[PDB]
């Protein structure tokens, strides 16, 4: 079975560098591109940039460009992500996966943990949080500053992340349903709105909802919407 396994965490001081590691099995690793995600709880995810295995060729978003080294062992199956200089703003947790919606496929994520005592398109989530009883309604709300549609297709997904569990793919393309999800998630939209619908709400459905546009570069997601069950 195809796994990305990395890491859980790394303790680090400010002004260090830190590598991170992805190693892949189950699958061959010079063939598809892998991606690097950060996490934060206030910016949701953000795309840091990618890389082709195969030869070494990388993409960087613009705002990481400094910040992050892509490199891949193909002896070993292992993809690296060096962050340098580090400091407080890149505690966070940084995913390596592959992120088009037919491959979907995500690494456990790795806690980075900075420790010192003393035009792109922006998602826009509505809500950030909610509540809902079991067996009632949850819709969440995901808002594009430019189209994300091309040639009568959204280049949009859903993301789910449940409590402890890595990211998976929901939704793809704005309202066709992964294989695996059950039927009462459903997803709607075009152009800049869309809307995700789950109803009826089981417990199983509590965790954090992010949605994602792949229709420009950079890639972009939304801030997360976090669901619990109301008891
Ligand atoms: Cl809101
Ligand atoms: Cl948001
Ligand atoms: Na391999
Ligand atoms: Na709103």
């Known amino acids: 079975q195809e796994q990305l396994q990395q890491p859980g965490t790394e303790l680090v001081k400010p002004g260090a560098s830190v590598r991170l590691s992805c190693k892949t099995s189950?699958?061959?690793?010079?063939?598809?591109?892998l991606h690097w995600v950060k996490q934060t709880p206030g910016q949701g995810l953000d795309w840091i940039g990618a890389?082709?295995?195969?030869?070494?060729?990388?993409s960087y978003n613009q705002k990481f460009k400094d910040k992050a080294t892509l490199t891949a062992d193909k002896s070993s199956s292992t993809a690296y992500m060096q962050l340098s200089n580090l400091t407080s703003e890149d505690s966070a947790v940084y995913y390596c996966?592959?992120?088009?919606?037919?491959?979907?496929?995500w690494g456990a994520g790795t806690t980075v943990t900075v420790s010192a005592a003393g035009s792109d398109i922006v998602l826009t989530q509505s809500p950030t949080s909610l509540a809902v009883s079991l067996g009632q309604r949850a819709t969440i709300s995901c808002k594009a500053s430019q189209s994300v549609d091309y040639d009568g297709d959204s280049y949009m997904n859903w993301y789910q992340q449940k409590p402890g569990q890595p990211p998976r793919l929901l939704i793809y393309?704005?309202?066709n349903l992964e294989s695996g999800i059950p039927a009462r998630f459903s997803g709607s939209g075009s152009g800049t709105d869309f809307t995700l619908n789950i109803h009826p709400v089981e417990e199983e459905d509590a965790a954090t909802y992010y949605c994602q546009q792949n229709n420009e570069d950079p890639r972009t997601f939304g801030g997360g919407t976090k669901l619990e069950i109301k008891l």
């Open positions: 393309a704005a309202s």
């Open positions: 890389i082709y295995p195969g030869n070494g060729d990388t």
């Open positions: 996966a592959r992120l088009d919606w037919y491959f979907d496929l």
């Open positions: 189950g699958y061959t690793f010079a063939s598809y591109t």
